[PDB]
Amino acid sequence: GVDISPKQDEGVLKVIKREGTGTETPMIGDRVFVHYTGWLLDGTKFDSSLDRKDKFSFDLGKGEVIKAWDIAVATMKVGELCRITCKPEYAYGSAGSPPKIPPNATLVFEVELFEFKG
Template sequence: MGSSCRFAMCVFVYIFYLLVLGVCGEIEVFEVDGVKVERLKIPETCDFSVQDGDQLKIHYRGTLEDGTEFDSSYSRNSPFAFTIGKGQVIKGWDIGIKGMCIGEKRKLTIPPDKGYGDQGFPPKIPGGATLIFETELIDID
């Protein structure tokens, strides 16, 4: 293969990579009351979105900033059920889950003041810990 063909092939591969990255790599990121929200998977349709008072079923994986997992509904093979906006979960969840659609996946980065604060939740969550949750909304009742 001549050098001009190799160059053309490299350009083609690079353009293809950029197109794939543009289509597949787009993640919506925003912040609400100090909670960073990354929409990892957005459903094509959304008939209902989460509002205060909704009963939810959510799968999640919780980690510390260093990647240490402290809890996961996946390991129990059962989504977590709760009512949003009623203080049944940490503030960061009440903030970061509002507006989700069934099938949506979000990554929440929750600062200590919206998580377990300075006291933490021993033994797995130290005081002052920033929490990372990968969440997936399974159902809204």
């Protein structure tokens, strides 16, 4: 249930809901297989991979997602889940997401992690 923003200024609060089950947390440059739901700060759901049919998957600091996902995935264990509460510095704040988001709108992502490296 960690935080790195109203202290050092790294844009995020990651809530533990479903802890851990396998063997450890991932490393910088790791291949990871996730499942996400996500909302804007007004309570508006822009995406939900669970409803669309397929899953989400990335490589920690390689192609790249958002900095709030690289911070929260680095601190997450094999198989379980967490809800991300992040500032625009770690997400769309520099330019905005093309169909609906501008340079100053806070975010919310509930992300599950199944497997990564060991």
